[PDB]
Design an enzyme around this catalytic site. Structure first.
Site, PDB file in Angstrom:
ATOM      1  CD  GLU A 135       3.613   7.064  -1.416  1.00 16.37           C
ATOM      2  OE1 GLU A 135       4.501   7.272  -2.275  1.00 16.37           O
ATOM      3  OE2 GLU A 135       3.668   6.117  -0.601  1.00 16.37           O
ATOM      4  CB  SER A 156      -0.951   1.462   4.167  1.00 15.15           C
ATOM      5  OG  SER A 156      -0.530   2.770   4.561  1.00 15.15           O
ATOM      6  N   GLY A 159       0.810  -1.206   0.000  1.00 12.66           N
ATOM      7  CA  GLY A 159       0.000   0.000   0.000  1.00 12.66           C
ATOM      8  C   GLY A 159       0.842   1.253   0.000  1.00 12.66           C
ATOM      9  CB  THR A 160       0.225   4.820  -0.715  1.00 10.25           C
ATOM     10  OG1 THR A 160      -0.704   5.396   0.211  1.00 10.25           O
ATOM     11  CG2 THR A 160      -0.492   4.370  -1.976  1.00 10.25           C
ATOM     12  CB  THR A 161       4.125   5.845   2.963  1.00  6.65           C
ATOM     13  OG1 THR A 161       5.094   5.042   2.271  1.00  6.65           O
ATOM     14  CG2 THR A 161       4.599   6.121   4.409  1.00  6.65           C
TER      15      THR A 161
END
Ligand SMILES: [Mg+2]
Ligand SMILES: [Mg+2]
Ligand SMILES: [Mg+2]
Ligand SMILES: [Mg+2]
Ligand SMILES: [Mg+2]
Ligand SMILES: [Mg+2]
Lengths: 203, 246, 196, 220, 234, 237, 246, 111, 241
Positions: free
Chosen positions: G51, G79, G34-36
């Site tokens: 993010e 995330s 996942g994104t941060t």
């Protein structure tokens, strides 16, 4: 009220090594007498049950108890005793606490093991009258109380008990418009049961 | 998991019941002995740590005032059966008749409970066998074994769990139909002494009898017709007493 | 019944008469209407005794559960729980309940919950059959921030007068004091309060 | 019915009259109103007799299971909570009114309980139709720190007040004494102050007095 | 080969944390025919290519109105599209009856997401194997959303889904700066859309039979053009 | 897949039913023989130890009511469940009609319960076969069996459990179409004697016959010593 | 590690012979893709940042909001599988409302943390569901101050000074750790906002191939009166400019 | 004792012409002797050239008009914007009303 | 099936339960519980290596009721599932029966719930060992411990964890020497000190105030120690001048 539509009475008494139980034969609908042969006393093994009140419930309870005691005998491998049956009647009645059978049952019998005479009565929701001289029930219960408290004495021989419970029933019935029209009397000892049909007024 | 987990195999055997028995056969030995004036049931109290207090657990359980039980196999299965057995004695018997059930019928209810675990969806059978000792007014003293299958048999004497083969043998030799409770207790001790590896005293042995009514355990006086309980568990002291003068 | 609860400078004091009647018969002359649902959260009971006991019992259970999960419940929260039970079951309760508590931030608090289950935070509250007779007295004698002693006196005088006029009130005057120092139970007998 | 409860220095005493009534009629002249919840917890009931008996049995059964489960002696407060919660759930329709007394590991206890589910606690209590007569005696003769023998006398005097003054009550006195550290002591017909005098004659009939139509042996 | 062990149900992670049943559901969309969505500040438009079974059959509807100010186009499992669009119709309707409020398109997307998600986390069912392009016009203006089988809903200026949709999607990226400015000029926004979907044709042409168009915007209720209604754009 | 109890095999066979039948073929043998004036039920006990309490049990034969008994082969605990439903069914019929239940009607109902488990619900079938002995005024003395298939048939004589084919052969040999209840007893004992893998402690025995005192029907669950005395008089002593 | 638990990793709620649940650890692998996202506990509050990968210029900027509010006082960011994240937040909203309804006071942060935890661990109990494919960073202000938590697919959660999850989590954690070391006296909310922007920026070097958009929210006694608010306008741009300078 | 019904007065009037119809209502809404509003419309355009008034207990009337307009919305969804004919509207309104036969909308409907 | 759900293996074993026991050591921390004359002390290691953690939120001890404390060996989410359940049971018990749930009764209850997960296929066991402590109103200082097999027993003292045999034997030796089954100190502080000292001994490590957590049951209540009180305890047993 439902308990006085059909009419009728039951009485049981203890004597020396005997018990007796008796009932009238009437089934009516208010003032109209309909059946001249409606007995109110049944038996499951050596235990006797008399029932007054609403005839349909009288019949229903009988069938219910024949059912329950038959299963008991099968499972327990012996026939139910009067003490045990008494509790069974109580709890069966109470199970219908808020929609009860309109009945006044009466139990009589001799315990097969103690040889001890036993009687009991119940209100319509199972309260037990543990009394052990006599029990009365039905539309002439006042009359019966009066007759029993008067005529009764303890440890009557069966032949004498027969006269006593007969006169109690007959005289109570003749002061009640909804009871009478014949009677049956059971004299119960260990080895013998005698059923008798009494001669009474037919009005 | 809405389907039976006990099913028939091509040999007709039911695996989960067999494996349940295997668990039973693995358990600590326990036994029962029926006398003319009583019944005894006994087991060993293996403490799985010395820091554990074995008195806080009970392998011999009162079910009714006149009926008790012991077991071999999985303890927690047993504990739970004990809870269920006590309740069914009230719900299907005492609340209807005002009387405690006679032994054979209470055994029969527990049998039902166990049978059900071998047929209902989503469950394994119980991993215990029970010995159940009772008295009732019309049958006198009795002794039953219930198995994970729900089968039960009446015994004059028997043993279950690990050392049961030798124990059943010992019991075959010493048993006769004139033992008095005291003989049966004595024999139970001698029997348990073979199975017992390690310590052997009133603290590693559990023992109860169904015998005479104990009015002193009633808790009240005044109803003379009221029978004391026939079930009594022996103290540590009482067990050691017999052990010294063995 | 005559029940009240009074905030003061150091916390809150609950007071009550001790009479429970059925008809004109005093079924209990020493009733304890001051009921604890948490350490420093208590309540005063009026109305059906079955109803108010049943309510307080379930509220004590909820706050016990609250405590083990979430920590100390606030006085407000306790009043919330009572209210929820009184409002939702309004058609089958006769309960007039005063909830009173202490905590370090608010000091004393009082919430009255009348028949119907509404809730009202107040500097003091009176309730029960006997309170009608002391509306005017309490209005003229209550001050904010009284001392403990001044507050005991106010309640003693208040409930003494309510007991004097109300047949449904009487017996002893019970008090519970909730402060930082803890929980204190007081009692006053007829021969004391009847002379005030 | 007249039932009372009286605490004493080392336990509690419970007592009842022995008359049960179908209306203005006495069904049982020597009835038993003192019920056992558990060996050391006893209760006396007024109100609807079937409800009083049934609810007694229900809780007694459950108290027994609870006690076996927890491996503890049953506590009076447990009978109290179970009963009141049951009675409340039924909104008064189970017409049980009980005085429950007992001793347990925490001490000695005395409670009353009404059909709607409310409960009281005190050192002396009364219930039933004869409770005003009994309570008049209690209010006249109670004192703190009764001995067993004094609490028996007082409770027994209170039942008597109802027996003599309440038409709803009569016949005999039954007591149960629950002392701390001892077996409960149930005294059935502790007093029997109402024996029927001898009748003036025997009403035994000569045999054959009663007419029979037919007769037969029944086979069990 | 390894994937074969972890793709049996939507309730099983692969050792790299994939849900293959959801990934497979995505592939169901590629079995559908292409549809495009795009928008400016005043209007939102859908364009779909409809399929027939042969020359004797009708062409299958691709565009479904969900309310006066909202509708969608689909590619993938037709039944799934019927279920999810009925659900949207109900949610719009609920918003109107209870609140006298037009359901925001952003809120429609969230409701849709949560429903589809549940199918991906419990045993018994399967993810929805259909893609939805949702257009609308609410208090915050014109919107376009793309719905994925995973439940995930994304707000876009334009996009394309279904077979060969990459061409249109590339064209929409390439023309982005232009089409988003087509305000007060609905036919021109439609022309951009038809042009975009054209990039996804392989030896086939847009006809009054296969071309479906939808539009919604300021003062413009959700309207669906089929048949001769699309000729001016062909 | 043969673990699953309510699905057909590719040959249209029901495996769990078939395996349940295998289990029964390993149970203690039970015979039933109908005479002109009575019926005989006999069961050889599976379990044997000397420490087994042989009297006060009877765990293979069961009264269902005054007029009907069963002999069991299979899991005894499985049996008890169905025995209890039957006793209840018989009592309901008595309560509804004020007549005793016709034997076939009680049999059909238990057979229906067994059948149910083969068609729906995913639960294993009961591992029991029953021989029903009964009397009613419609058909007089009757003998039936039922098995986990939920099938039932009527018999003049029959066996279930272990060594069934050996037993059936002997019964086919020495069965007269109109015997006497005392001979059918003898035949039963002989036939159990010829297949035992035989003493009183290993037997349960029952009869249903005209009481001869009089005109009524009687169910006798033989006691252990009774079994002894009948084991000698037929020369198996 | 055996990363693949062959024979024990095919269904949820199964214990491997070393007492692991592999499905839960696999669910973690999805979270790591996942994104941060991060959380920073500050002096009188908490800050969240995520993010957001610009996969195509077709995405409309400042839409597709990731941070969610629960009640009025709690923020959540996660995330991994975003729809699992919404699912969990929906549950949190009901739990919060249900608490507020009985008890009147807004749900305290540790209480809210445990509601989410029990629900998340309930999904490791049965094979009829799968674990959540998100790690969730969340918290806010209550009567006891600022609280920040992180909750994993197992149901495990703890309170944090700073928390990071998603693809760039190692980088972010390192900066979170420097931040802690460098601020023993505490961090203002405004400061935390800027520092949060910097951290997301540094973490983005893991997804450097794609553009991104920064999303930031906070809940602070002095800045938002203990309500959850999205960081917007000048403060946002100020943090964006600051992050870029580094 | 809660009474779920009220009376809001008002009167309505429908007349059919050869190629037209008219539905009229007054705009007054009342409670006992009070005027709630001098202008609260009670005749509604329900679409498809269908006009409707449910007069009496205004809360039931509003509810009934709401349910019917919704019924049109769904008719259109189900049948590609097919016009609901007036006879078809009438039969449908029969069902809405009889659906509540044992707790009826206390209104007089005209369309 | 038998490697995945709680059904018997041919050896009559339950694998998922056995594996559940393995789960209990995954947090790699030890606990011990000891009884005093008039208190019960529970102690457990606390390992918070990640410096981003708030150590004050890291705990495997739980206040179940006013009188009952619990320490869990096993992963925190199964730990907190059990803690929640026990809290609810204890509250329900007091409401229904009108007195505080005894420690052994709560232990039995949880043992039973646990045995059910070993019998029903669809539920997995909790991977936890639950140590329950209190000063019971009838039984005095009490320690009852439950496992994923549904087993429980009372203890003079106990230890749970990867190094539990070490600590256990350390205690047995002490109780042999001492001839009583508890620590003869009235001060709960001295009982805590005792427990820290014997755990330090058995594990061959020293502790700072952050390396452990401590619960204490008395007649009045069960409570946990702040890091500050723990430090005060560590000082009491400091052997260097
Ligand atoms: Mg009468
Ligand atoms: Mg007459
Ligand atoms: Mg006449
Ligand atoms: Mg007064
Ligand atoms: Mg039409
Ligand atoms: Mg399981």
């Amino acid at each position: 009220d439902p308990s006085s539509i059909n009419g009728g009475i039951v009485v049981a008494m203890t004597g020396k090594d005997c018990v007796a139980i008796a009932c009238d034969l009437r089934l009516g609908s208010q003032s109209l007498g309909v059946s001249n042969k409606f007995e109110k006393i049944f038996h499951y093994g050596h235990v006797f049950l008399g029932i007054t009140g609403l005839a349909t419930d009288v019949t229903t309870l009988n069938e219910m108890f024949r059912y329950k005691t038959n299963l008991y005998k099968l499972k327990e491998e012996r026939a139910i005793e009067p003490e045990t049956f008494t509790q069974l009647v109580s709890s069966s009645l109470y199970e219908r606490r808020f929609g009860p059978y309109f009945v006044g049952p009466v139990v009589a019998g001799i315990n097969s093991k103690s040889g001890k005479p036993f009687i009991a009565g119940f209100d319509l929701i199972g309260c037990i009258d543990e009394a052990k001289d006599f029990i009365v029930s039905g539309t002439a219960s006042d009359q019966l109380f009066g007759m029993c408290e008067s005529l009764y004495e303890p440890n009557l021989e069966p032949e004498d008990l027969f006269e006593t419970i007969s006169q109690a029933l007959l005289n109570a019935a003749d002061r009640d418009a909804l009871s009478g029209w014949g009677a049956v009397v059971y004299i119960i000892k260990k080895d013998e049961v005698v059923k008798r049909y009494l001669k009474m007024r037919q009005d | 998991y809405s389907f039976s987990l006990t099913t028939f195999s091509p040999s007709g055997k039911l695996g989960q019941i067999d494996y349940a028995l295997t668990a039973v056969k693995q358990g600590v030995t326990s036994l029962g002995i029926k006398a003319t004036n009583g019944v005894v049931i006994a087991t060993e109290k293996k403490s799985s740590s010395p820091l554990a207090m074995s008195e806080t657990l009970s392998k011999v359980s009162l079910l009714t005032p006149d009926i008790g039980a012991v077991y071999s196999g999985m303890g927690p299965d047993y504990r739970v059966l004990v809870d269920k057995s006590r309740k069914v004695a009230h719900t299907s018997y005492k609340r209807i008749y005002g009387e405690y059930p006679p032994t054979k019928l209470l055994v029969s209810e527990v049998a039902k409970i166990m049978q059900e675990a071998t047929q209902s969806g989503g469950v394994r059978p119980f991993g215990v066998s029970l010995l159940i000792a009772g008295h009732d007014e019309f049958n006198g003293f009795s002794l039953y074994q219930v198995d994970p299958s729900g089968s039960y048999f009446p015994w004059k004497a028997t043993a279950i769990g690990k050392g049961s083969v030798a124990a059943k043998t010992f019991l075959e030799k010493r048993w006769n139909d004139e033992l008095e409770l005291e003989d049966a207790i004595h024999i139970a001790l001698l029997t348990l002494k073979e199975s017992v590896e390690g310590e052997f005293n009133g603290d590693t042995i559990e023992l109860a009898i169904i015998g005479d009514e104990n009015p002193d355990l009633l808790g009240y006086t005044g109803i003379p017709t009221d029978k004391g309980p026939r079930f009594r568990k022996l103290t540590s002291q009482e067990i050691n007493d017999r052990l010294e003068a063995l | 019944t005559s029940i009240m609860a009074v905030t003061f400078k150091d916390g809150v004091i609950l007071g009550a008469d001790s009479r429970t009647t059925t008809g004109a018969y005093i079924a209990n002359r020493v009733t304890d209407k001051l009921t604890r649902v948490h350490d420093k959260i208590w309540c005063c009971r009026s109305g059906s005794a079955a109803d108010t006991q049943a309510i307080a019992d379930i509220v004590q259970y909820h706050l016990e559960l609250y405590t083990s999960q979430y920590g100390t419940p606030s006085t407000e929260t306790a009043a919330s729980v009572f209210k929820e039970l009184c409002y939702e079951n309004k058609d089958n309760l006769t309960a007039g309940i005063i909830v009173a508590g202490y905590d370090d931030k608010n000091k004393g608090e009082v919430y009255t919950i009348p028949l119907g289950g509404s809730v009202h935070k107040l500097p003091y509250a009176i309730a029960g059959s006997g309170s009608t007779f002391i509306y005017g007295y309490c209005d003229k004698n209550f001050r904010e921030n009284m001392s403990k002693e001044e507050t005991v006196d106010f309640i003693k005088h208040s409930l003494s007068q309510a007991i004097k006029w109300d047949g449904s009130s009487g017996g002893v005057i019970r008090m519970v004091v909730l402060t930082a120092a803890g929980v204190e139970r007081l009692i006053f007998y007829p021969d004391e309060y009847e002379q005030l | 019915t007249t039932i009372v409860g009286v605490k004493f220095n080392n336990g509690v005493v419970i007592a009842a009259d022995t008359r049960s009534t179908q209306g203005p009629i006495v069904a049982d002249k020597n009835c038993a109103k003192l019920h056992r919840i558990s060996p050391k917890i006893w209760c006396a009931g007024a109100g609807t007799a079937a409800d009083t008996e049934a609810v007694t049995q229900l809780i007694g059964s459950n108290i027994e299971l609870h006690s076996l489960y927890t491996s503890r002696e049953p506590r009076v407060v447990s009978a109290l909570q179970m009963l009141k919660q049951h009675l409340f759930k039924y909104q008064g329709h189970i017409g049980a009114y009980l005085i429950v007394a007992g001793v347990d590991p925490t001490g000695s206890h005395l409670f009353s309980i009404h059909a709607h589910g409310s409960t009281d606690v005190g050192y002396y209590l009364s219930l039933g139709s004869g409770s005003l007569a009994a309570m008049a005696v209690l209010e006249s003769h109670w004192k703190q720190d009764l001995t067993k023998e004094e609490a028996i006398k007082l409770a027994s005097d209170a039942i008597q007040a109802g027996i003599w003054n309440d038409l709803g009550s009569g016949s005999n006195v039954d007591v149960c004494v629950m002392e701390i550290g001892k077996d409960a002591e149930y005294l059935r017909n502790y007093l029997t102050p109402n024996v029927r005098e001898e009748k003036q004659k025997s009403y035994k009939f000569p045999r054959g007095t009663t007419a029979v139509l037919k007769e037969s042996i029944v086979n069990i | 080969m390894f994937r074969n062990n972890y793709d049996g149900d939507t309730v099983t992670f692969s050792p790299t944390g994939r849900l293959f049943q959801v990934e497979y559901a995505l592939e169901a969309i590629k079995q559908g025919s292409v549809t495009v969505g795009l928008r400016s500040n005043t209007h939102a438009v859908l364009v779909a290519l409809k399929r027939n079974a042969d020359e004797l059959s009708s062409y299958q509807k691709k565009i479904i109105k969900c309310d006066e100010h909202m509708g969608l186009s689909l590619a993938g499992l037709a039944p799934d599209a019927r279920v999810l669009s009925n659900y949207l119709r109900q949610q719009c309707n609920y918003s109107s009856l209870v609140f006298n409020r037009k359901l925001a398109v952003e809120r429609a997307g969230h409701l849709l997401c949560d429903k589809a998600q549940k199918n991906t986390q419990s045993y018994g069912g399967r993810p929805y194997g259909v893609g939805l392009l949702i257009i609308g016009y609410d208090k915050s203006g014109a919107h376009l959303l793309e719905f994925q089988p995973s439940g995930n809903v994304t707000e876009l200026y334009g996009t394309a889904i279904g077979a060969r949709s990459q061409g249109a999607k590339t064209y929409l990226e390439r023309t982005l700066d232009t089409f988003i400015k087509i305000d007060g000029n609905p036919d021109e926004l439609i022309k951009a859309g038809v042009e975009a979907i054209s990039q996804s044709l392989r030896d086939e042409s847009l006809t009054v039979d296969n071309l479906s168009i939808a539009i919604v915007g300021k003062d413009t209720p959700f309207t669906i053009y089929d048949g001769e209604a699309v000729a001016k754009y062909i | 897949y043969d673990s699953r109890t309510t699905i057909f095999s590719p040959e249209g066979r029901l495996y769990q039913v078939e395996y349940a039948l295998e289990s029964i073929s390993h149970a203690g043998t039970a015979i039933g023989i109908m005479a002109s004036d009575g019926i005989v039920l006999a069961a050889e006990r599976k379990v044997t130890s000397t420490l087994l309490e042989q009297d006060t049990s009877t765990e293979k034969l069961y009264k269902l009511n005054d007029k009907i008994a069963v002999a069991v082969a299979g899991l005894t605990a499985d049996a008890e469940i169905l025995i209890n439903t039957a006793r209840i069914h018989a009592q309901n019929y008595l309560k509804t009609y004020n007549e005793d239940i016709p034997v076939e009607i009680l049999v059909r109902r238990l057979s229906d319960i067994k059948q149910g488990y083969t068609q729906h619900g995913g639960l294993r079938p009961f591992g029991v076969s029953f021989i029903y002995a009964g009397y009613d005024d419609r058909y007089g003395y009757q003998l039936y069996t039922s098995n986990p298939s939920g099938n039932y048939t009527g018999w003049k004589a029959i066996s279930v459990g272990a060594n069934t084919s050996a037993a059936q052969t002997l019964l086919q040999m020495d069965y007269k179409d109109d015997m006497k209840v005392d001979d059918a007893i003898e035949l039963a004992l002989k036939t159990l004697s010829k297949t035992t893998d035989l003493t009183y402690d290993r037997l349960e025995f029952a009869t249903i016959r005209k009481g001869a005192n009089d005109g009524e029907v009687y169910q006798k669950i033989f006691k252990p010593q009774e079994i002894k005395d009948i084991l000698v008089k037929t020369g198996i002593t | 590690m055996t990363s693949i638990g062959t024979g024990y990793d095919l269904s949820n709620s199964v214990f491997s012979p070393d007492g692991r649940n592999f499905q839960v650890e696999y669910a973690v692998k999805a979270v790591e893709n996942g994104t941060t996202s991060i959380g920073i506990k500050c002096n009188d509050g908490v800050v969240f940042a995520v993010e957001k990968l610009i996969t195509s210029k077709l995405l409309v900027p400042q839409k597709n909001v990731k941070i969610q509010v629960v009640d009025r006082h709690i923020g959540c960011v996660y995330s991994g599988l975003i729809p699992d994240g919404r699912h969990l937040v929906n549950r949190g909203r009901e739990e919060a409302a249900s608490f507020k309804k009985l008890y009147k006071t807004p749900i305290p942060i540790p209480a809210f943390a445990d509601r989410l935890g029990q629900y998340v661990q309930a999904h490791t109990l049965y094979n009829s569901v799968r674990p959540f494919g998100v790690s969730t960073i969340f918290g806010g202000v209550d009567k006891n101050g600022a609280h920040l938590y992180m909750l994993e697919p197992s149901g495990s959660y703890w309170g944090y000074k700073g928390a990071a999850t998603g693809k760039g989590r190692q980088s972010a954690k390192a900066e979170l750790e420097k931040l802690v070391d460098h601020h023993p006296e505490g961090l203002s909310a405004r400061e935390a906002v800027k520092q949060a922007a910097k951290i997301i920026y540094l973490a983005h070097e893991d997804n450097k191939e794609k553009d991104f958009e920064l999303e930031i929210s906070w809940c602070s006694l002095s800045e938002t009166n203990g309500l959850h608010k999205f960081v917007k306008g000048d403060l946002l741009q100020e943090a964006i400019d600051f992050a870029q300078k580094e | 004792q809660f009474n779920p019904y009220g009376d809001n007065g008002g009167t309505i009037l429908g007349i059919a012409g050869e190629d037209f119809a008219v539905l009229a209502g007054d705009t007054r809404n009342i409670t006992d002797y009070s005027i709630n509003s001098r202008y609260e419309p009670k005749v509604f355009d329900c679409g498809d050239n269908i006009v409707m008034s449910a007069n009496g207990f205004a809360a039931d009337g509003d509810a009934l008009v709401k349910r019917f307009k919704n019924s049109v919305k769904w008719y259109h969804f189900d049948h590609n914007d097919k016009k609901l004919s007036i006879n078809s509207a009438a039969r449908n309104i029969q069902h809405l009303l009889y659906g509540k036969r044992f707790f009826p909308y206390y209104v007089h409907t005209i369309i | 099936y038998d490697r995945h759900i709680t059904i018997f293996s041919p050896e009559g074993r339950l694998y998922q339960v056995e594996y559940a026991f393995k789960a209990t050591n995954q947090t790699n921390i030890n606990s011990l519980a000891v009884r005093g004359k008039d208190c019960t002390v529970v102690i457990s290691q606390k390992k918070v290596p990640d410096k981003l953690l708030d150590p004050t939120t890291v705990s495997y001890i739980f206040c179940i009721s006013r009188t009952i404390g619990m320490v869990v060996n096993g992963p925190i989410p199964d730990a907190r599932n059990a803690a929640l359940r026990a809290k609810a049971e204890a509250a329900e018990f007091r409401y229904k029966y009108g007195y505080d749930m005894p420690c052994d009764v709560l232990a039995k209850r949880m043992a039973n719930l646990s045995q059910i997960y070993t019998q029903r296929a669809y539920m997995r066991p909790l991977g936890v060992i639950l140590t329950f402590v209190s000063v019971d109103e009838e039984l005095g200082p009490s320690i009852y411990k439950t496992d994923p097999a549904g087993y429980y027993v009372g203890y003079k003292a106990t230890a749970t964890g990867p190094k539990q045999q070490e600590i256990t034997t350390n205690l047995e030796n002490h109780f042999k020497k001492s001839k009583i089954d508890h620590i003869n100190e009235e001060s709960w502080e001295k009982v805590v000190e005792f427990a820290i000292t014997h755990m330090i001994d058995a594990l061959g490590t020293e502790f700072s105030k952050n390396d452990l957590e401590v619960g204490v049951a008395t007649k009045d209540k069960f409570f946990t120690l702040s890091a500050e009180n723990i430090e005060e305890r560590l000082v009491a047993i400091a052997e260097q001048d």
